[PDB]
Symmetry: C2
């Protein structure tokens, strides 16, 4: 028999998931209604791929996309100069947020990018993608521009993911089962409103994606979360040591959000950016637990 | 200082090259008896091969050799019996308790169908069993003091649930237990004193539940591990591994008091309900098995 989780998933997929997100660039630009869109590529030593990702987004710059930033995390290869030649604005962690010393990890980069961007919508795309497609950004922003109440859009790939299927999804089933409807909770391609992203803490390192997903859910529920199919992509092979470290941080971040203490046996969470920037901006929509 | 604790446990409680002979282990039994239990559900292709590696010990080191069948419809029972095991159904093991599915149920029920002071569990689906498995698993129980649970591990040629799920969760919630190389392994031996007195987690949670309960109740030095040899990882489909992971999570959460929704993976089987210590249902058997000097 269907569970409450099953029923919620069915209707959430009907309303908030797009397998064929075929909005046109023209109709999305027309829907902006004065809102601006920033695209951020976090990057650490991605010289072979960063230019290719920038190249797929560059045609939107000056139309759908208002700024295209590579937030470099201290590369020692040619990541930064290749991003420049490909047509992006390269900003370091230190320039993005001068008053806070950096610490390692991807979450730090995305958090700092909130201070370096101005868009009402911020889109994150990994800089290590081997086969980026030019429609990633349109598909990610579609629900934010057209679907009332959506604040976070997760881009997923159809397959022709061990941490996702063995760690993230089973832990969500135990701790936040409604979120098992999200196909790829750890995915690096996603978009959010400034109102949402400035109001939540950012988990460090490999925990950033899952932390944003759970913080959004705990604040707004499933209604605020959407997902879109970015296309067919094969799984990329990562070393087991990388996967184990990713798993351990996914666990730590889930535990910190879900009331589970953690030994610390294996970086700190950053506070909402609205404690440092945009301090008087309008608050994220209320979602009351009392009446 | 914490890696120091793990390093010292490895020095005293882990054996990469157990030296023990069958003869020296028999000489050390000192009146203790050993029961070997193989859980089996539809393992006709491998069960006989596993039994054949243990059968030569029967009447010497090993006092009984049982396959606990969970309702096979293939030729598991006849092949196990032909190879020299006594085949016991779940119903025979514990007749007045209705069976429920999963591996934990089978191991728990076997406690009511055995008499050993030591119980050794060996999986019946092993493709490459070796006759020294039982000797290696019982070595620390017979020759060391204070050991109650011995976990058999395999060196790998130079799994994902262990490295991505079990070990990182133990780092978070029972940090000393990351010293155990293969916490989910199905080859292990325990004392009657331990096994008769702990609840048994259901299904794929049984191994980690026993490990954590032993750690909490009896301590790190009550756990040991032994290398059974080099074996390649077995290829299991991702949906099986994900279901196993979900139950490992549920059982660990149960042992920590973390509220677990009980919701499976789109739907995999998840149970949050243990079986109670067998000494509650077989009190006279349990008391008969308790050594006269237990509380002395
Ligand atoms: Cl993954
Ligand atoms: Cl495994
Ligand atoms: Mg990289
Ligand atoms: Mg313009
Ligand atoms: Mg630099």
């Amino acid at each position: 028999d269907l569970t409450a989780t099953d029923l919620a998933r069915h209707r959430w997929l009907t309303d908030n998931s797009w397998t064929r997100p075929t909005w046109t660039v023209a109709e999305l630009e027309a829907a902006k209604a004065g809102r601006t869109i920033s695209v951020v590529l976090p990057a650490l030593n991605e010289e072979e791929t960063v230019g290719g990702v920038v190249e797929t987004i560059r045609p939107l710059l000056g139309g759908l996309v208002d700024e295209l930033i590579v937030l470099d995390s201290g590369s020692t290869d040619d990541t930064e100069i290749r991003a420049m030649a490909a047509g992006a604005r390269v900003i370091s962690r230190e320039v993005a947020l001068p008053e806070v010393a950096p610490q390692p990890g991807k979450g730090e980069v995305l958090w700092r990018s909130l201070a370096a961007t101005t868009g009402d919508i911020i889109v994150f795309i990994d800089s290590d993608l081997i086969d980026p497609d030019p429609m990633f950004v349109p598909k990610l922003v579609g629900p934010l521009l057209l679907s009332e109440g959506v604040h976070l859009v997760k881009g997923f790939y159809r397959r022709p993911g061990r941490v996702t299927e063995l760690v993230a999804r089973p832990l969500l089933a135990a701790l936040r089962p409604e979120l098992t409807c999200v196909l790829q909770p750890l995915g690096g391609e996603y978009a959010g409103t400034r109102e949402l992203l400035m109001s939540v803490p950012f988990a460090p390192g490999y925990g950033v994606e899952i932390g944003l997903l759970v913080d959004t859910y705990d604040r707004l529920g499933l209604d605020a979360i959407a997902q879109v199919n970015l296309g067919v992509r094969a799984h990329r092979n990562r070393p087991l040591t990388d996967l184990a470290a990713m798993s351990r941080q996914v666990i730590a971040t889930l535990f910190s959000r879900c009331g589970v203490p953690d030994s610390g046996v294996g970086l700190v969470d950053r506070p909402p950016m609205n404690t440092l920037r945009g301090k008087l901006a309008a608050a994220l929509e209320h979602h009351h637990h009392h009446h």
